[PDB]
Design an enzyme around this catalytic site. Structure first.
Site, PDB file in Angstrom:
ATOM      1  N   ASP A  31      25.093  52.911  43.578  1.00 48.48           N
ATOM      2  CA  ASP A  31      26.123  51.883  43.421  1.00 48.48           C
ATOM      3  C   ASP A  31      27.163  52.491  42.489  1.00 48.48           C
ATOM      4  O   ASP A  31      26.858  52.728  41.261  1.00 48.48           O
ATOM      5  CB  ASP A  31      25.498  50.593  42.911  1.00 48.48           C
ATOM      6  N   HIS A  77      27.597  49.337  46.742  1.00 49.33           N
ATOM      7  CA  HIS A  77      27.850  48.141  45.916  1.00 49.33           C
ATOM      8  C   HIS A  77      27.915  46.829  46.706  1.00 49.33           C
ATOM      9  O   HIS A  77      27.870  45.767  46.053  1.00 49.33           O
ATOM     10  CB  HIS A  77      29.088  48.398  45.086  1.00 49.33           C
ATOM     11  N   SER A  84      28.815  40.927  41.800  1.00 50.69           N
ATOM     12  CA  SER A  84      29.910  41.585  41.030  1.00 50.69           C
ATOM     13  C   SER A  84      30.295  40.654  39.851  1.00 50.69           C
ATOM     14  O   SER A  84      29.387  40.069  39.175  1.00 50.69           O
ATOM     15  CB  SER A  84      31.043  41.966  42.022  1.00 50.69           C
TER      16      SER A  84
HETATM   17  O1  LIG Z   1      37.889  52.152  40.657  1.00 52.24           O
HETATM   18  C1  LIG Z   1      37.179  51.119  40.577  1.00 52.24           C
HETATM   19  N1  LIG Z   1      35.848  51.307  40.567  1.00 52.24           N
HETATM   20  C2  LIG Z   1      35.034  50.236  40.526  1.00 52.24           C
HETATM   21  O2  LIG Z   1      33.797  50.445  40.595  1.00 52.24           O
HETATM   22  N2  LIG Z   1      35.535  48.930  40.436  1.00 52.24           N
HETATM   23  C3  LIG Z   1      34.674  47.821  40.450  1.00 52.24           C
HETATM   24  C4  LIG Z   1      33.945  47.357  39.331  1.00 52.24           C
HETATM   25  C5  LIG Z   1      33.145  46.249  39.479  1.00 52.24           C
HETATM   26  C6  LIG Z   1      32.916  45.611  40.698  1.00 52.24           C
HETATM   27  O3  LIG Z   1      32.104  44.556  40.712  1.00 52.24           O
HETATM   28  C7  LIG Z   1      33.654  46.077  41.883  1.00 52.24           C
HETATM   29  N3  LIG Z   1      33.532  45.468  43.195  1.00 52.24           N
HETATM   30  O4  LIG Z   1      33.964  46.169  44.137  1.00 52.24           O
HETATM   31  O5  LIG Z   1      32.946  44.227  43.399  1.00 52.24           O
HETATM   32  C8  LIG Z   1      34.482  47.186  41.686  1.00 52.24           C
HETATM   33  C9  LIG Z   1      36.961  48.630  40.379  1.00 52.24           C
HETATM   34  C10 LIG Z   1      37.462  47.348  40.297  1.00 52.24           C
HETATM   35  C11 LIG Z   1      38.834  47.094  40.260  1.00 52.24           C
HETATM   36  C12 LIG Z   1      39.646  48.230  40.333  1.00 52.24           C
HETATM   37  C13 LIG Z   1      39.219  49.515  40.453  1.00 52.24           C
HETATM   38  C14 LIG Z   1      37.829  49.793  40.457  1.00 52.24           C
END
Ligand SMILES: O=c1[nH]c(=O)n(-c2ccc(O)c([N+](=O)[O-])c2)c2ccccc12
EC number: 3.1.-.-
Length: 264
Positions: A215, A244, A94
């Site tokens: 993902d 993910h 991430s």
């Molecule tokens: O609604 C969301 N959808 C997402 O995919 N993410 C998100 C984006 C990047 C990432 O690396 C991750 N993660 O879960 O490690 C989560 C978010 C990350 C923070 C807050 C909300 C969201």
């Protein structure tokens, strides 16, 4: 040293070749607990918590400092220098994938290779680039997170895990609910505001790009984008794992793919 204590730095394993495991958004180093046994015989493993982790004293999360990924990079380099690491393989999930990319541009000799898992240089769509998110959609997310943090965690964790793996949904929920909500919102804006597209070509270390199926955070085309734009020798691994968080949902299979990438 007080930084090593503050970020829960742990060094384990019987080997000499250094392997850094760096967790991403919404987790802490415990996300690597089920990978770790597969690396103790032949690596020296280094784990730490990002300053935003729910396992870190919230008094360390300085909102005036942690406004972009750069100060996270400074923490990572401070840890490797304090441990006297002069070369390692680095695995970043991430946001830690982007932290490692930046660290390698600063210190190209410190990393033999980067392994990027669930990595994206840009989440927001534009006319020439698909990241998977619209600005309007992200705003509505931030509103929901502010309205009811617990409800937001319980709605998002199943999407992030993706596959029907209830233990991983409970585990990710656990670490997200431990993060202080003010920190989580601020870090979420850091994540969505990130734009690493202009710096990918500056990377000269070989990168293995681990991409799962379906993902929610990372469209398949973004893994292709990283392969085309990262400056060094790139290898895409299309994991037979959905969602993910493969370290939480499919650790035995992810561990064998990591072992393969770290060999060659
Ligand atoms: O609604 C969301 N959808 C997402 O995919 N993410 C998100 C984006 C990047 C990432 O690396 C991750 N993660 O879960 O490690 C989560 C978010 C990350 C923070 C807050 C909300 C969201």
């Amino acid at each position: 040293q007080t930084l090593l204590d503050a970020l829960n730095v742990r060094v384990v394993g019987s080997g000499e070749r250094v392997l850094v495991l760096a967790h991403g958004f919404g987790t802490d180093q415990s996300a690597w607990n089920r990978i770790l046994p597969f690396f103790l015989r032949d690596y020296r493993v280094v784990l730490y918590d990002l300053v935003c982790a729910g396992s870190v004293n919230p008094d360390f999360f300085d909102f005036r400092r942690y406004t972009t990924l750069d100060p996270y990079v400074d923490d990572l380099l401070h840890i490797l220098d304090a441990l006297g690491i002069d070369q390692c393989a680095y695995v970043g999930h991430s946001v830690s994938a982007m932290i490692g990319i930046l660290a390698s541009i600063r210190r190209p000799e410190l990393f033999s290779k980067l392994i990027l898992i669930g990595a994206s240089p840009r989440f927001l769509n534009d006319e020439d680039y698909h990241g998977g998110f619209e600005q309007g959609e992200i705003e509505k997310v931030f509103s929901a997170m502010e309205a009811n943090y617990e409800a937001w965690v319980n709605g998002f964790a199943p999407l992030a895990v993706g596959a029907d793996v209830p233990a991983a949904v409970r585990e990710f929920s656990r670490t997200l609910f431990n993060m202080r909500p003010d920190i989580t919102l601020f870090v979420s804006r850091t994540v969505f505001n990130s734009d690493m597209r202009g710096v990918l070509g500056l990377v000269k270390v070989p990168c293995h790009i681990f991409q799962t199926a379906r993902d929610h955070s990372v469209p398949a085309s973004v893994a292709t984008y990283l392969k085309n734009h990262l400056g060094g020798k790139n290898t895409v691994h299309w994991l037979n794992i959905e969602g993910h968080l493969p370290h939480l949902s499919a650790p035995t299979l992810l561990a064998q793919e990591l072992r393969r990438a770290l060999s060659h």
